[PDB]
Coordinates of all heavy atoms in Angstrom, one line a residue:
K31 N 45.8 -52.6 92.3 CA 46.3 -53.7 91.5 C 45.9 -53.6 90.1 O 46.8 -53.8 89.2 CB 45.6 -55.0 92.1 CG 46.2 -55.4 93.4 CD 45.4 -56.5 94.2 CE 45.9 -56.7 95.6 NZ 45.0 -57.6 96.3
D32 N 44.7 -53.1 89.8 CA 44.3 -52.8 88.4 C 45.1 -51.7 87.8 O 45.4 -51.8 86.5 CB 42.8 -52.7 88.3 CG 41.9 -53.8 88.7 OD1 42.5 -54.9 88.5 OD2 40.8 -53.6 89.0
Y33 N 45.3 -50.7 88.5 CA 46.2 -49.6 88.0 C 47.6 -50.1 87.7 O 48.2 -49.8 86.7 CB 46.2 -48.5 89.1 CG 47.4 -47.5 88.9 CD1 47.2 -46.3 88.3 CD2 48.6 -47.7 89.6 CE1 48.2 -45.4 88.1 CE2 49.6 -46.8 89.4 CZ 49.4 -45.6 88.8 OH 50.4 -44.7 88.7
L34 N 48.1 -51.0 88.6 CA 49.5 -51.6 88.4 C 49.5 -52.4 87.1 O 50.3 -52.3 86.2 CB 49.9 -52.4 89.5 CG 50.3 -51.6 90.8 CD1 50.8 -52.6 91.8 CD2 51.5 -50.6 90.4
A35 N 48.5 -53.3 87.0 CA 48.4 -54.2 85.8 C 48.3 -53.4 84.5 O 48.8 -53.7 83.5 CB 47.2 -55.1 85.9
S36 N 47.5 -52.3 84.5 CA 47.5 -51.4 83.3 C 48.7 -50.6 83.1 O 48.7 -49.8 82.2 CB 46.3 -50.4 83.5 OG 46.6 -49.3 84.2
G37 N 49.8 -50.9 83.7 CA 51.1 -50.2 83.5 C 51.3 -48.9 84.3 O 52.2 -48.1 83.8
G38 N 50.5 -48.6 85.3 CA 50.8 -47.4 86.1 C 52.0 -47.5 87.0 O 52.4 -48.6 87.5
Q39 N 52.6 -46.4 87.2 CA 53.8 -46.3 88.0 C 53.5 -46.4 89.5 O 52.6 -45.8 89.9 CB 54.6 -45.1 87.8 CG 54.9 -44.7 86.3 CD 55.9 -45.6 85.6 OE1 57.0 -45.3 85.6 NE2 55.4 -46.7 85.0
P40 N 54.2 -47.3 90.2 CA 53.9 -47.6 91.6 C 54.0 -46.3 92.5 O 54.6 -45.3 92.1 CB 54.9 -48.6 92.0 CG 55.5 -49.2 90.8 CD 55.4 -48.1 89.8
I41 N 53.3 -46.4 93.7 CA 53.3 -45.3 94.7 C 54.8 -45.1 95.0 O 55.5 -46.1 95.3 CB 52.5 -45.7 95.8 CG1 51.0 -45.6 95.5 CG2 52.7 -44.8 97.0 CD1 50.1 -46.5 96.4
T42 N 55.2 -43.9 95.0 CA 56.6 -43.5 95.3 C 56.7 -42.9 96.8 O 55.8 -42.8 97.5 CB 57.1 -42.5 94.3 OG1 56.3 -41.3 94.4 CG2 57.1 -43.0 92.9
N43 N 58.0 -42.5 97.1 CA 58.3 -41.9 98.4 C 58.0 -42.7 99.6 O 57.8 -42.2 100.7 CB 57.6 -40.5 98.5 CG 58.0 -39.5 97.4 OD1 59.2 -39.3 97.3 ND2 57.0 -39.0 96.7
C44 N 58.0 -44.0 99.4 CA 58.1 -44.9 100.6 C 59.4 -44.7 101.2 O 60.4 -44.4 100.6 CB 58.0 -46.4 100.2 SG 56.4 -46.7 99.3
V45 N 59.5 -44.7 102.6 CA 60.5 -44.2 103.3 C 61.5 -45.4 103.6 O 61.3 -46.2 104.5 CB 60.1 -43.6 104.7 CG1 61.4 -43.1 105.5 CG2 59.2 -42.4 104.4
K46 N 62.6 -45.4 102.9 CA 63.6 -46.4 103.0 C 64.7 -46.1 104.1 O 65.2 -45.0 104.1 CB 64.4 -46.7 101.7 CG 65.2 -48.0 101.7 CD 65.6 -48.5 100.3 CE 66.7 -47.7 99.8 NZ 67.2 -48.3 98.4
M47 N 64.9 -47.0 105.0 CA 65.8 -46.9 106.1 C 67.2 -47.2 105.9 O 67.4 -48.2 105.0 CB 65.3 -47.6 107.4 CG 63.7 -47.5 107.6 SD 63.2 -45.7 107.7 CE 64.2 -45.1 109.0
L48 N 68.2 -46.6 106.5 CA 69.5 -47.1 106.6 C 69.6 -48.3 107.7 O 69.0 -48.1 108.7 CB 70.5 -46.0 107.0 CG 70.6 -45.1 105.9 CD1 71.1 -43.7 106.4 CD2 71.5 -45.5 104.7
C49 N 70.2 -49.4 107.4 CA 70.3 -50.5 108.3 C 71.5 -51.3 107.9 O 72.1 -51.2 106.9 CB 69.0 -51.3 108.4 SG 68.4 -51.9 106.8
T50 N 71.8 -52.3 108.8 CA 72.9 -53.2 108.5 C 72.7 -54.2 107.4 O 73.7 -54.6 106.8 CB 73.3 -54.0 109.8 OG1 72.1 -54.7 110.2 CG2 73.7 -53.0 110.9
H51 N 71.5 -54.5 107.2 CA 71.1 -55.6 106.3 C 71.7 -57.0 106.7 O 72.0 -57.8 105.9 CB 71.5 -55.3 104.8 CG 70.8 -54.2 104.2 ND1 69.7 -54.3 103.5 CD2 71.1 -52.8 104.4 CE1 69.3 -53.0 103.1 NE2 70.1 -52.1 103.7
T52 N 71.8 -57.2 108.0 CA 72.1 -58.4 108.6 C 71.0 -58.8 109.7 O 71.3 -59.4 110.7 CB 73.4 -58.4 109.3 OG1 73.5 -57.4 110.4 CG2 74.5 -58.0 108.3
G53 N 69.7 -58.4 109.4 CA 68.6 -58.7 110.3 C 68.0 -60.0 110.0 O 68.4 -60.7 109.1
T54 N 66.9 -60.3 110.8 CA 66.2 -61.5 110.8 C 65.5 -61.8 109.4 O 65.2 -62.9 109.1 CB 65.2 -61.6 111.9 OG1 64.1 -60.7 111.7 CG2 65.9 -61.2 113.2
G55 N 65.2 -60.7 108.6 CA 64.5 -60.9 107.5 C 63.0 -61.1 107.6 O 62.3 -61.4 106.6
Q56 N 62.5 -61.0 108.8 CA 61.0 -61.2 109.0 C 60.3 -60.0 108.4 O 60.8 -58.9 108.1 CB 60.6 -61.3 110.5 CG 61.1 -62.5 111.1 CD 60.8 -62.5 112.6 OE1 61.5 -61.9 113.3 NE2 59.8 -63.3 113.0
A57 N 59.0 -60.2 108.2 CA 58.2 -59.3 107.3 C 58.0 -57.9 107.9 O 58.2 -56.8 107.3 CB 56.9 -59.9 106.9
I58 N 57.4 -57.9 109.1 CA 57.0 -56.6 109.8 C 57.5 -56.6 111.2 O 57.2 -57.6 112.0 CB 55.5 -56.5 109.8 CG1 54.9 -56.5 108.4 CG2 55.0 -55.3 110.5 CD1 53.4 -56.6 108.2
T59 N 58.4 -55.7 111.5 CA 59.2 -55.8 112.7 C 59.2 -54.4 113.4 O 58.8 -53.4 112.9 CB 60.6 -56.2 112.5 OG1 61.1 -55.4 111.4 CG2 60.6 -57.7 112.0
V60 N 59.6 -54.4 114.7 CA 59.6 -53.2 115.5 C 60.8 -52.2 115.1 O 60.7 -51.0 115.5 CB 59.5 -53.5 117.0 CG1 58.3 -54.3 117.4 CG2 60.8 -54.1 117.5
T61 N 61.8 -52.8 114.5 CA 62.9 -52.0 114.1 C 63.4 -52.7 112.7 O 63.0 -53.8 112.5 CB 64.1 -52.1 115.1 OG1 65.0 -50.9 114.9 CG2 64.8 -53.4 115.1
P62 N 64.2 -51.9 111.9 CA 64.5 -52.5 110.7 C 65.2 -53.8 110.8 O 66.1 -54.0 111.6 CB 65.5 -51.5 110.1 CG 64.9 -50.2 110.6 CD 64.4 -50.5 112.0
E63 N 64.8 -54.9 110.0 CA 65.3 -56.2 110.1 C 65.7 -56.7 108.7 O 65.7 -58.0 108.5 CB 64.4 -57.2 110.8 CG 64.2 -56.9 112.3 CD 65.5 -57.3 113.1 OE1 66.4 -57.9 112.5 OE2 65.5 -57.0 114.3
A64 N 65.9 -55.9 107.7 CA 66.3 -56.3 106.4 C 67.5 -57.2 106.4 O 68.5 -56.9 107.2 CB 66.6 -55.1 105.5
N65 N 67.5 -58.4 105.7 CA 68.7 -59.2 105.5 C 69.4 -58.7 104.2 O 69.1 -57.6 103.7 CB 68.3 -60.6 105.5 CG 67.3 -61.0 104.4 OD1 67.3 -60.4 103.3 ND2 66.5 -62.0 104.7
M66 N 70.3 -59.5 103.7 CA 71.1 -59.1 102.5 C 70.2 -59.0 101.3 O 70.6 -58.2 100.4 CB 72.2 -60.1 102.3 CG 73.1 -59.8 101.1 SD 74.7 -60.6 101.0 CE 74.4 -61.8 99.6
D67 N 69.0 -59.6 101.3 CA 68.2 -59.7 100.1 C 67.0 -58.6 100.2 O 66.1 -58.7 99.4 CB 67.6 -61.1 99.9 CG 68.7 -62.1 100.0 OD1 69.7 -61.9 99.3 OD2 68.5 -63.2 100.6
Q68 N 67.0 -57.7 101.2 CA 65.8 -56.9 101.5 C 66.2 -55.5 101.8 O 67.4 -55.2 102.0 CB 65.1 -57.4 102.7 CG 64.5 -58.9 102.7 CD 64.1 -59.3 104.0 OE1 64.6 -58.9 105.0 NE2 63.1 -60.2 104.0
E69 N 65.2 -54.6 101.6 CA 65.3 -53.2 102.1 C 64.2 -53.1 103.2 O 63.1 -53.8 103.2 CB 64.9 -52.3 100.9 CG 65.9 -52.4 99.8 CD 67.1 -51.5 99.9 OE1 67.6 -51.3 101.1 OE2 67.7 -51.1 98.9
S70 N 64.5 -52.3 104.1 CA 63.6 -52.0 105.2 C 62.9 -50.6 105.0 O 63.6 -49.6 104.7 CB 64.3 -52.0 106.6 OG 64.6 -53.3 107.0
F71 N 61.7 -50.5 105.2 CA 60.9 -49.2 105.0 C 60.1 -48.9 106.3 O 59.6 -49.8 107.0 CB 59.9 -49.3 103.8 CG 60.6 -49.4 102.5 CD1 61.0 -50.6 102.0 CD2 60.8 -48.2 101.7 CE1 61.6 -50.7 100.7 CE2 61.4 -48.4 100.4 CZ 61.8 -49.6 99.9
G72 N 59.9 -47.6 106.5 CA 58.9 -47.1 107.4 C 57.6 -47.6 107.1 O 57.2 -47.5 106.0
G73 N 56.8 -48.2 108.1 CA 55.7 -48.9 107.7 C 54.5 -48.1 107.2 O 53.9 -48.4 106.2
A74 N 54.3 -46.9 107.9 CA 53.1 -46.1 107.4 C 53.3 -45.7 105.9 O 52.3 -45.7 105.2 CB 53.1 -44.8 108.3
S75 N 54.5 -45.4 105.5 CA 54.7 -45.0 104.1 C 54.5 -46.1 103.1 O 54.4 -45.8 101.9 CB 56.1 -44.4 103.9 OG 57.0 -45.5 104.0
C76 N 54.4 -47.3 103.5 CA 54.1 -48.5 102.6 C 52.7 -49.0 102.7 O 52.4 -50.1 102.1 CB 55.1 -49.6 102.9 SG 56.8 -49.2 102.8

C-alpha cells in the first residue's frame, strides 16, 4: 500500500482469463464469473 501511494507501479503478470463476461459478478468463485464490468483472474496470481 505504501509503495503504491508513493507512485510505484502495481504488481504485473496477474493471469487474466478469457470468459463470457456474463457471470454472476461475485468476488471469488470456483470458475470465472466476471460480468460486463469486470475481468476474471487466476486467484493465485492476484
Side-chain angles (χ1 to χ4, degrees):
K31 287 166 187 170
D32 293 337
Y33 164 92
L34 286 180
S36 84
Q39 311 285 269
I41 290 160
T42 60
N43 296 306
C44 301
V45 176
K46 193 164 79 172
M47 315 308 301
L48 294 158
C49 50
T50 60
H51 296 265
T52 63
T54 72
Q56 288 176 290
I58 300 171
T59 51
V60 305
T61 200
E63 289 289 352
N65 58 31
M66 183 164 102
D67 311 313
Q68 300 166 331
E69 302 274 27
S70 290
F71 292 86
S75 70
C76 300

